[PDB]
Amino acid sequence: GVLIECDPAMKQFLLYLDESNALGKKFIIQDIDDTHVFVIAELVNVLQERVGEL
Amino acid sequence: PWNLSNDEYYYPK
Amino acid sequence: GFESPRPYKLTHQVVCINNINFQRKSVVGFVELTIFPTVANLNRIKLNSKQCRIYRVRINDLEAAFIYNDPTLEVCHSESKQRNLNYFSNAYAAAVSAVDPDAGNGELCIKVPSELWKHVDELKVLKIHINFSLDQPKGGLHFVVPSVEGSMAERGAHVFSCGYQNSTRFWFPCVDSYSELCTWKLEFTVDAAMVAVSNGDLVETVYTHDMRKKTFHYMLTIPTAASNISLAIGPFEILVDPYMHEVTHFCLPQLLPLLKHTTSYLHEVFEFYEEILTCRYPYSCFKTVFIDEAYVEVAAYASMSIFSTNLLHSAMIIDETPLTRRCLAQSLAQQFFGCFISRMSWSDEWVLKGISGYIYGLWMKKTFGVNEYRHWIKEELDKIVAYELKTGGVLLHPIFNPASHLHFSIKHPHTLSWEYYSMFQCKAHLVMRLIENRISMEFMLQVFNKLLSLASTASSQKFQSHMWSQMLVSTSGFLKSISNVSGKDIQPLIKQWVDQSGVVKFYGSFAFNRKRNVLELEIKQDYTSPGTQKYVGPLKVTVQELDGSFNHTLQIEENSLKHDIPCHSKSRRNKKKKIPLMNGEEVDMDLSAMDADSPLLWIRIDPDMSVLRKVEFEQADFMWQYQLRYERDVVAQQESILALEKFPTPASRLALTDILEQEQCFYRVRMSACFCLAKIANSMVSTWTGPPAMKSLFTRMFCCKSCPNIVKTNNFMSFQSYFLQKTMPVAMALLRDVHNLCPKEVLTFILDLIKYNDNRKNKFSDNYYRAEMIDALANSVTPAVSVNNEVRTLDNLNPDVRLILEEITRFLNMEKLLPSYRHTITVSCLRAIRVLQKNGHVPSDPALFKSYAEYGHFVDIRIAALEAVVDYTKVDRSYEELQWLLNMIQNDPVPYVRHKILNMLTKNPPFTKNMESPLCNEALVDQLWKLMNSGTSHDWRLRCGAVDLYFTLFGLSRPSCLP
Amino acid sequence: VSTFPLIAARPFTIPYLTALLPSEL
């Protein structure tokens, strides 16, 4: 899988995005820690676009 | 020498 | 639609035995047979007689020449030197066919007189009178005489029927066939003080003119097979059940209180059978007989039963009352169906045996709860799958012998091995449960009621094999009755398991796709083994989910190796909520161990066990722990406990501890969790900094909080405390160390428990628990390693072992001063003595066990001592000890004990066939062959044990080491 | 004989009566 290190506040934004995504039931593969999460390699580029919104 | 089972706890009816 | 195999039909038979002498062990009697020819020119008449000598045979009061030949007595010719078991088995099968009652040929043939030919052609009543004297009948009945010299009634000497299946022929000549049905009239001249016990109610009693003896007349209203009929002569005390006037209790003198407690629950078993089946008990009266040295611990006869004195128990005695209660129920179930309905043919036994086992199982489920019944069914399933893997397959309904993988022929029950015969009956009972899973129980009970109704109408009439044919049941008739009641035949289920004679093993690997949110199951079957069979049937799998418990059925098609089932939402993990269990009650479950990707809490394959199956499914450790903690099914809990055996995780050890701590948990599941805790501790040795496993648990529940060494006085009123208390020090002894030695501190704690053990608070007996403590002491002892082959000596004896030796020595001396009710402490002391002798602490002594094995000592002491001798002979490869065991079988007063020695020898052979041991002398092979050929035929079970021993020692192929 | 003596096992003319009856009742 893919390991991404993110802020806990960013992880909550990712968790809401995970519920929002309809391509897959969940967008977050695993939650080892708030700092370390497993992310599907599809909307990582979209997340960079979402940085302005966030 | 007995039933020795908590059937009432396992099932309400 | 039944036609008698015999041309003659026996309408009625009169059994009379008079002037029986206990001192001579001789039975003298005259028997009259009433037969109607169904064909003209009946001519020669054949009857089944074994070891029977007749002064004369008269037909219609006319002397008729009779010729008697017994093939079974000499199955193998003295000249023939063949040592291959297969050759002996083929000759034995031919001999059994000649003596078979179902077969037209009979061992005794009578030539009808020339003047009686004119009467034989016209169909008219024919009467045969035979007078027979047996100086020492073998297998017909067992005579027990006490050493003290007194009147036989005064000394309590007792006589009872012995042997199994068709053993009726030995005591008196008769048509010993299940198919044959006749009304029974029985007359017996016995002593005044003694009371005769016979099948059917006693019509009348007449005193003899001398008045020192009397005449007990017995009539059975329902026609029954000859095998069911039995005779017992003893001064049995007479007790009439208060609940039911018909039920009668017979016991040896001074055993009346034990008998009252044993038969206290008998009325409840009768009520359960009456509740399930509308038809009331057919026999006018029911009689129970308890006798010492019984051939079978539980025996079933028509209107009569035989049980060991060991079964009789006082109200205080515990752990024997359930065993006695179940034995009474299973025999009563056989009386309700197997005795009431005779078999139409040999291949038909399974259906009757299965129905009796299934109804007994229903009684067990109500009496001991559903959880105990589910655990019992799991045990039955485990025995069948292991036995088929061990040898051939368990085939029921033998239509020929068909299945040849088993060395013993399936043609006769006597030819079949006793263990195989028991397995076949167990499989039949499980097959009936499978029908109950497939079709509603009420329909199954209705089918049983129809069969009982057919027997009742046959009993009411005297129609020779016309209405009597209705009583006899066939497998075809059973299938048709089920098909009529539910609209669905059970023939596909019967073909899948009974006809195939195979068991199914499933290996499961599961792959989960997160993107599709579905679970994929791969099932592979090891059907390559001959015993195992391919399964194309669907398999039900229950997968626990966060949303709830869901049941999925997927057919195991050969074409599709992967079965996909959708997975429920994991929203319950996201927001904490109650998760519903399979049982109505639901509890919150920790989800931290469970993976976020997989919603399912755990996977169970065939938890219901609707179809008999063996499951080997790979599942993650944390899911197994979750299954054990929240499972509402005992069988699923047992499989999870065994899966944690192969998982040394501290969280798996925690799950077993949590189950023991949890209240409202099955005591048997907790006992398994105790053993598994010890096993896990022994795998992760040196990873535990905490106190020894279960030592704290014992102090918490069975010991005072203030003092760990002090133990609270035992109380057995709950009836679950004794089982939990006994398993803890046994599993604490099994718990070892990094050096694999039971800790001295654990051994000291066990010794402290014995020292502080009290008996003035337990209202029940502590002797059963004290025996378990002796077993724990034996388990804790670890064998010393000799240096330069050092001889064991008192000075070199280990001090920790010496304390265990002191406790067992004191217990044995206390046992001599005060004996246990079943001598449980003595049996445990013998087992402990054998362990100490096997270990390098005490020199092994064969004589000590041999003295215990003698007839004068209690039977329970004898069986334990004989097992120790069997272990000694295997360990030392001692020819003389093996010869002593063989000699005891050749000359043993009790038939049951001699069979046990052969069975134990088969369980622990001195040398296996592959191994080449010094005990490979041709004379030893000849002695075993001679034992099978003669001296085991009368019992009919001794030969089966001898054949199985011959197999484990040499096998089908002629002994590799045959000079 | 002095250390760990075992009382000799004795044959019983009527084994069932002695074994079945409770020692204390």
In this complex, do C858 and D13 lie within 8 Å of one another by their Cβ atoms? Answer: no
CA distance to partner chain B, nearest, from residue C261 (Å): 12
In this complex, do C258 and D20 lie within 8 Å of one another by their Cβ atoms? Answer: yes
Count of positions (residues) in chain B:
13
CA distance to partner chain C, nearest, from residue D12 (Å): 5
C621 vs C654: CA distance, rounded Å: 12
C651 vs C535: CA distance, rounded Å: 36
CB burial string A13-50: b at 16+ within 10 A, e below = bbbebbeebeebbbbbbeeeeeeebebbeebeeebeee
Question: Which residues numbered 579-608 in C keep a CB inside 8 Å of some CB on A?
Answer: 595-597
Q: Which residues contact C580 (CB under 8 A, 6 or more apart)?
A: C548, C549, C586
Instruction: Please count the CA atoms within 13 angstroms of the CA of C766 that sit on its side-chain side.
Output: 18
Q: Which of C308, C298, C236 is nearest to C822 (CA)?
A: C308
Cβ neighbourhood burial of C42 (10 Å; 0-12, 13-18, 19+): buried
For the four alpha carbons of C928, C929, C931 and C936, in that order, the dihedral sign comes to positive
C156 → chain D, closest CA residue: D14
Q: CB–CB of C11/C34 below 8 Å?
A: yes
Instruction: Please count the CA atoms within 13 angstroms of the CA of C626 that sit on its side-chain side.
Output: 25
Q: CB–CB of C323/C304 below 8 Å?
A: no
* Best residue in C317, C318, C366, C664 for a mutation probing chain B (most B CBs within 10 Å): C664
C279 vs C274: CA distance, rounded Å: 7
**Amino acid letter, residue C842:** V
> What is the DSSP secondary structure assignment for residue C747, as one 8-state letter?
H
Q: Give the CATH number of the domain where residue A23 resides.
A: 3.30.70.1220
Q: CB–CB of C340/C258 below 8 Å?
A: no
Looking at the complex, does the CB of residue C719 fall below 8 Å from at least one CB of chain B? yes
**Amino acid letter, residue C612:** L
In this complex, do C369 and B1 lie within 8 Å of one another by their Cβ atoms? Answer: no
CA distance to partner chain C, nearest, from residue A53 (Å): 25
Count of positions (residues) in chain A:
54
Q: Which of C682, C607, C694 is nearest to C648 (CA)?
A: C682
Token pair in block for residue C607: 């938890």
In this complex, do B7 and C370 lie within 8 Å of one another by their Cβ atoms? Answer: yes
Q: Which residues of chain A are within 8 Å of residue C514 when distances are taken between CB atoms?
A: 24-26, 29
* Best residue in D13, D20, D23, D24 for a mutation probing chain C (most C CBs within 10 Å): D20
Token pair in block for residue B2: 């007995």
In angstroms, what CA-CA distances link C761 with C335, C765, C870? 41, 10, 40
Instruction: Please count the CA atoms within 13 angstroms of the CA of C58 that sit on its side-chain side.
Output: 9
Looking at the complex, does the CB of residue C369 fall below 8 Å from at least one CB of chain B? yes
C863 vs C852: CA distance, rounded Å: 9
Question: Which residues numbered 345-404 in C keep a CB inside 8 Å of some CB on A?
Answer: none
- How many domains is chain A built from? 1
Q: Which of C57, C182, C62, C46 is nearest to C119 (CA)?
A: C62
Token pair in block for residue A6: 């993110």
Q: Which residues of chain C are within 8 Å of residue B10 when distances are taken between CB atoms?
A: 583, 585, 632, 664
CA distance to partner chain C, nearest, from residue D17 (Å): 7
**Touching chains, C (3+ CB pairs < 8 A):** A, B, D
Token pair in block for residue C683: 């795998």
**Amino acid letter, residue C111:** K
Q: CB–CB of C678/C648 below 8 Å?
A: no
Dihedral of the CA atoms C95, C97, C98, C103 (nearest 10)?
170
Q: Which of C335, C334, C345, C301 is nearest to C472 (CA)?
A: C345
A26 → chain C, closest CA residue: C515
A14 vs C726: CA distance, rounded Å: 56
C221 vs A17: CA distance, rounded Å: 84
In this complex, do C252 and D16 lie within 8 Å of one another by their Cβ atoms? Answer: yes
Size of interface B-C (CB pairs under 8 A): 36
Q: CB–CB of C922/C954 below 8 Å?
A: no
User: How do A36-39 and A3-5 pair as beta strands?
Assistant: antiparallel
Angle at C854 between CA C852 and CA C860, to 5 degrees: 60
CA distance to partner chain C, nearest, from residue D24 (Å): 9
Identify the residue whose tokens are 């047979």. C33
> What is the DSSP secondary structure assignment for residue C209, as one 8-state letter?
S
C314 vs C318: CA distance, rounded Å: 8
In angstroms, what CA-CA distances link C695 with C147, C751, C946? 50, 13, 46
Q: Which of C870, C875, C901 is nearest to C888 (CA)?
A: C901
Q: CB–CB of C277/C449 below 8 Å?
A: yes
CA distance to partner chain A, nearest, from residue C516 (Å): 8
C264 vs C848: CA distance, rounded Å: 40
Looking at the complex, does the CB of residue C561 fall below 8 Å from at least one CB of chain A? no
Number of H helices, E strands in chain A: 2, 3
Cβ neighbourhood burial of C685 (10 Å; 0-12, 13-18, 19+): middle
C621 vs C651: CA distance, rounded Å: 9
C737 vs C739: CA distance, rounded Å: 5
In angstroms, what CA-CA distances link C373 with C262, C368, C377? 22, 7, 6
Token pair in block for residue C784: 């010393």
C486 vs C444: CA distance, rounded Å: 9
**Amino acid letter, residue C947:** V
Q: How many CB atoms lie within 10 A of CB C447?
A: 22
Nearest neighbour of A24 by CB, restricted to C515, C570, C595: C515
In this complex, do C514 and A26 lie within 8 Å of one another by their Cβ atoms? Answer: yes
Q: Which residues contact C259 (CB under 8 A, 6 or more apart)?
A: C237, C239, C249, C251, C290, C312
**Amino acid letter, residue C731:** A
C430 vs C607: CA distance, rounded Å: 15
In this complex, do B11 and C664 lie within 8 Å of one another by their Cβ atoms? Answer: no
In angstroms, what CA-CA distances link C155 with C150, C213, C892, D22? 5, 17, 22, 21
C747 vs C569: CA distance, rounded Å: 52
> What stretch of H or E contains C26?
strand C26-37
C514 → chain A, closest CA residue: A29
Nearest neighbour of C664 by CB, restricted to B2, B6, B12: B6
Q: Which of C104, C103, C81, C100 is nearest to C92 (CA)?
A: C100
Structural domain that includes position A9: 1-54
In this complex, do D9 and C146 lie within 8 Å of one another by their Cβ atoms? Answer: no
C861 vs C323: CA distance, rounded Å: 19
Token pair in block for residue C392: 């051939």
Strand order in the sheet with C505-513: C562-566, C518-525, C505-513, C614-617
C753 vs C772: CA distance, rounded Å: 12
> Does chain D touch chain A (at least 3 C-beta pairs within 8 Å)?
no
Token pair in block for residue C124: 């008219």
In this complex, do B1 and C719 lie within 8 Å of one another by their Cβ atoms? Answer: yes
Which runs of consecutive H residues, i.e. helices, occur in D1-25? Answer: 15-20
For the four alpha carbons of C952, C953, C959 and C960, in that order, the dihedral sign comes to positive
Looking at the complex, does the CB of residue C450 fall below 8 Å from at least one CB of chain B? no
C842 vs C805: CA distance, rounded Å: 9
Angle at C693 between CA C748 and CA C644, to 5 degrees: 145
**Resolution of the entry in angstroms:** 4.1
A30 vs C157: CA distance, rounded Å: 79
C936 vs C598: CA distance, rounded Å: 63
Q: Which of C278, C282, C273 is nearest to C361 (CA)?
A: C273
Q: CB–CB of C615/C606 below 8 Å?
A: yes
Q: Which of C85, C77, C69 is nearest to C954 (CA)?
A: C85
Q: Which residues contact C487 (CB under 8 A, 6 or more apart)?
A: none
Q: CB–CB of C702/C725 below 8 Å?
A: yes
Q: CB–CB of C64/C110 below 8 Å?
A: yes
DSSP helix/strand/coil, C844? coil
Experimental method: cryo-EM
Q: Which residues of chain C are within 8 Å of residue B3 when distances are taken between CB atoms?
A: 367-369, 372
Strand order in the sheet with C66-68: C45-47, C108-110, C66-68
CB burial string C543-572: b at 16+ within 10 A, e below = bbbbbebbeeebebeeeeeebeeebbebeb
CA distance to partner chain C, nearest, from residue A49 (Å): 24
Biggest CA pair distance of chain B: 24
Q: Which residues of chain B are within 8 Å of residue C370 when distances are taken between CB atoms?
A: 5, 7
In this complex, do D23 and C818 lie within 8 Å of one another by their Cβ atoms? Answer: yes
Identify the residue whose tokens are 């272990």. C871
Which runs of consecutive H residues, i.e. helices, occur in C20-167? Answer: 85-99, 117-121, 152-155
DSSP assignment of C792-836 = P-TTTS-HHHHHHHHHHHHHHHHHHHS--SS-HHHHHHHHHHHHH
Q: Which of C505, C521, C524, C523 is nearest to C513 (CA)?
A: C521
Residue C251's DSSP bridge partners are C237
In this complex, do D12 and C855 lie within 8 Å of one another by their Cβ atoms? Answer: no
Q: Which residues of chain A are within 8 Å of residue C598 when distances are taken between CB atoms?
A: none
Q: Which residues of chain D are within 8 Å of residue C860 when distances are taken between CB atoms?
A: 19
> Does chain B touch chain D (at least 3 C-beta pairs within 8 Å)?
no
Q: How many CB atoms lie within 10 A of CB C196?
A: 25
C130 vs C64: CA distance, rounded Å: 10
Nearest neighbour of C369 by CB, restricted to B1, B3, B13: B3
Q: CB–CB of C519/C567 below 8 Å?
A: yes
**Touching chains, A (3+ CB pairs < 8 A):** C
DSSP helix/strand/coil, C605? strand
C529 vs B12: CA distance, rounded Å: 46
C518 vs C511: CA distance, rounded Å: 9
In angstroms, what CA-CA distances link C844 with C831, C838, C872, C935? 13, 7, 8, 32
Q: CB–CB of C677/C384 below 8 Å?
A: no
Q: Which residues of chain A are within 8 Å of residue C595 when distances are taken between CB atoms?
A: 30
DSSP helix/strand/coil, C473? strand
In this complex, do C861 and D9 lie within 8 Å of one another by their Cβ atoms? Answer: yes
> What is the DSSP secondary structure assignment for residue C789, as one 8-state letter?
S
In this complex, do B11 and C583 lie within 8 Å of one another by their Cβ atoms? Answer: yes
Nearest neighbour of A29 by CB, restricted to C517, C570, C597: C597
